[PDB]
């Protein structure tokens, strides 16, 4: 009955919110136990329940972001958090298309005078 992220992948949002609430109720009881003289087993359960709480929130956040990215896939403007991070300097670079652009004067020069392959006899 341990919580594993794989088991949680396909579930609905409200189903995970319910599962989250049960763990949060459980942790609060354990925190009451921590000060009323609960056995070592209950104390050790705190860390197990805390990471179970993290796992559920992780799967909720991940699932929500996955669908937001699908939502904004075809959109021109996306939320700043859905745009590539990279580094600040790399985000300000000329993009792929802009770097490939050449003036018509340079395109004609390359067509008429392409660098050739040759050899010189020894």
């Amino acid at each position: 009955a341990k919580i594993k992220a794989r088991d949680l992948r396909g579930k609905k949002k409200e189903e995970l919110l319910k599962q989250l609430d049960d763990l949060k109720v459980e942790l609060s009881q354990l925190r009451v136990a921590k000060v009323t003289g609960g056995a070592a087993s209950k104390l050790s359960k705190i860390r197990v329940v805390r990471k179970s709480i993290a796992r559920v929130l992780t799967v909720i956040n991940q699932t929500q972001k996955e669908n937001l990215r699908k939502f904004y896939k075809g959109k021109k403007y996306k939320p700043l958090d859905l745009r590539p991070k990279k580094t600040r300097a790399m985000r300000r670079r000329l993009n792929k298309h802009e770097e490939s652009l050449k003036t018509k004067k340079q395109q004609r020069k390359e067509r008429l005078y392409p660098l050739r392959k040759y050899a010189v006899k020894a």
Binding site: Q64, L68, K70, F71
Partner: peptide
């Protein structure tokens, strides 16, 4: 049975936050 077990594409609009849904409608 226990001894047996212990030895072995599109947007889901329900996961979109409400606020985004309100903005589009």
């Amino acid at each position: 049975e226990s001894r047996k077990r212990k030895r072995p594409n599109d947007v889901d609009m329900s996961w979109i936050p409400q606020e985004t849904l309100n903005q589009i409608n």
